[PDB]
Design an enzyme around this catalytic site. Sequence first.
Site, PDB file in Angstrom:
ATOM      1  N   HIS B  44       0.806  -1.229   0.000  1.00  0.00           N
ATOM      2  CA  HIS B  44       0.000   0.000   0.000  1.00  0.00           C
ATOM      3  C   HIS B  44       0.831   1.268   0.000  1.00  0.00           C
ATOM      4  CE1 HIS B  44      -2.480  -2.753   2.829  1.00  0.00           C
ATOM      5  NE2 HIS B  44      -2.940  -2.954   1.585  1.00  0.00           N
ATOM      6  N   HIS B  46       1.061   4.715   1.748  1.00  0.00           N
ATOM      7  CA  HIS B  46       0.632   5.306   2.997  1.00  0.00           C
ATOM      8  C   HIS B  46       0.885   6.785   2.921  1.00  0.00           C
ATOM      9  CE1 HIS B  46      -0.202   1.912   5.836  1.00  0.00           C
ATOM     10  NE2 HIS B  46       0.083   1.325   4.688  1.00  0.00           N
ATOM     11  N   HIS B  61      -3.427   4.620   5.056  1.00  0.00           N
ATOM     12  CA  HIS B  61      -3.368   4.562   3.598  1.00  0.00           C
ATOM     13  C   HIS B  61      -3.682   5.932   3.021  1.00  0.00           C
ATOM     14  CE1 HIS B  61      -4.181  -0.045   3.498  1.00  0.00           C
ATOM     15  NE2 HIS B  61      -2.971   0.283   3.919  1.00  0.00           N
ATOM     16  N   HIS B  69     -11.440   0.993   2.905  1.00  0.00           N
ATOM     17  CA  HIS B  69     -10.399   0.222   2.272  1.00  0.00           C
ATOM     18  C   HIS B  69     -10.996  -0.791   1.309  1.00  0.00           C
ATOM     19  CE1 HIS B  69      -6.420  -1.815   2.237  1.00  0.00           C
ATOM     20  NE2 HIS B  69      -7.101  -2.964   2.351  1.00  0.00           N
ATOM     21  N   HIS B  78      -9.031   2.953  -1.077  1.00  0.00           N
ATOM     22  CA  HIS B  78      -8.165   4.115  -0.904  1.00  0.00           C
ATOM     23  C   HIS B  78      -7.359   4.241  -2.189  1.00  0.00           C
ATOM     24  CE1 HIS B  78      -8.191   2.362   3.403  1.00  0.00           C
ATOM     25  NE2 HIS B  78      -9.139   3.317   3.331  1.00  0.00           N
ATOM     26  N   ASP B  81      -4.390   1.705  -2.089  1.00  0.00           N
ATOM     27  CA  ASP B  81      -4.588   0.257  -2.055  1.00  0.00           C
ATOM     28  C   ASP B  81      -4.161  -0.436  -3.355  1.00  0.00           C
ATOM     29  OD1 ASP B  81      -5.646   0.813   0.432  1.00  0.00           O
ATOM     30  OD2 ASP B  81      -7.723   0.723  -0.262  1.00  0.00           O
ATOM     31  N   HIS B 118       3.482  -5.161   3.771  1.00  0.00           N
ATOM     32  CA  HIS B 118       2.956  -5.554   5.081  1.00  0.00           C
ATOM     33  C   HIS B 118       3.276  -7.005   5.363  1.00  0.00           C
ATOM     34  CE1 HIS B 118       0.393  -2.017   6.073  1.00  0.00           C
ATOM     35  NE2 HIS B 118       0.208  -1.926   4.771  1.00  0.00           N
ATOM     36  N   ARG B 141       4.018  -3.341   9.328  1.00  0.00           N
ATOM     37  CA  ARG B 141       4.681  -2.753   8.181  1.00  0.00           C
ATOM     38  C   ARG B 141       6.115  -3.234   8.190  1.00  0.00           C
ATOM     39  NH1 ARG B 141       0.677   2.165   9.374  1.00  0.00           N
ATOM     40  NH2 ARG B 141       2.347   3.730   9.310  1.00  0.00           N
TER      41      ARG B 141
HETATM   42 CU   LIG Z   1      -1.126  -0.585   4.162  1.00  0.00          CU
HETATM   43 ZN   LIG Z   2      -6.419   0.858   2.314  1.00  0.00          ZN
END
Ligand SMILES: [Cu+2]
Ligand SMILES: [Zn+2]
Lengths: 151, 151
Positions: B44, B46, B61, B69, B78, B81, B118, B141
């Site tokens: 993702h 961020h 995100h 999400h 998002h 994503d 992640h 993360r």
């Molecule tokens: Cu993420």
């Molecule tokens: Zn997201």
Amino acid sequence: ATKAVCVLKGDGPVQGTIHFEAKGDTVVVTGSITGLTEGDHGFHVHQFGDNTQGCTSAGPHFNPLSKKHGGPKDEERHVGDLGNVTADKNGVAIVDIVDPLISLSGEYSIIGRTMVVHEKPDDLGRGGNEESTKTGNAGSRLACGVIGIAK
Amino acid sequence: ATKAVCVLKGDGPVQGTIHFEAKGDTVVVTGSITGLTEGDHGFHVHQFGDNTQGCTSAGPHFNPLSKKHGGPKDEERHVGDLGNVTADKNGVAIVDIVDPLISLSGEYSIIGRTMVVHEKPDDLGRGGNEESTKTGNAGSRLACGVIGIAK
Ligand SMILES: [Cu+2]
Ligand SMILES: [Zn+2]
Ligand SMILES: [Cu+2]
Ligand SMILES: [Zn+2]
């Protein structure tokens, strides 16, 4: 962005955290760097936010206007020219700059580029030679970071 | 920019270099990651390019339009994503994404923000809890980096 931030790391003792804040059309640069040898070090925004080869792949100074190298106040300077930062005898440098040329949006936006602290003082383009008109002869890149959005 | 790049680092085995390029009204995202366990991992963008507390300070995100999400295909996701990358048995993930939502400029620009890989698979918002609709239950993360401008 209106607020950005930079963490300077290298393969040395020199670390720091640089903060950026848009005030009208100036950037208040604030922060500190530690591990520096006493005195001045050149402090430049280099062109690319590229860490695949450490600080080397950050390129030259952010210079979208094709000027010569210079200090923060000179009319002839790269946009990325923020001059010298001064370490005390304990090797720490408080950064404190208000620059109307660099910015955090539009063109001249430094977001995603690279903040570099140099081994040697910047001669501010006023030197007996031609590397002066490029890098200010600030020597190596001790620590660097990609300037990212903070707020 | 029309090209950006991202060095994924954390405190771990995991590392990678992610390449973004503007291709029409899309960003093609290419690269590879290593150090991962096999199968799926959330991948993702961020919100904050804030590396002061490592990956933690990246924030949530990138989600300027306040949507819940989802996966990169959903109506409702998002902008950050980009879903899952998959590590083969040898801990290696070949990245290869083209996205219509993220951009290297304008609104939605991902320059200066953080790319995060992640610990677990994104559930694309199809778990049954709040954590699904925000995070994908993607987990810690593992590695992140700030997205910088590339030559
Ligand atoms: Cu993420
Ligand atoms: Zn997201
Ligand atoms: Cu420099
Ligand atoms: Zn310069």
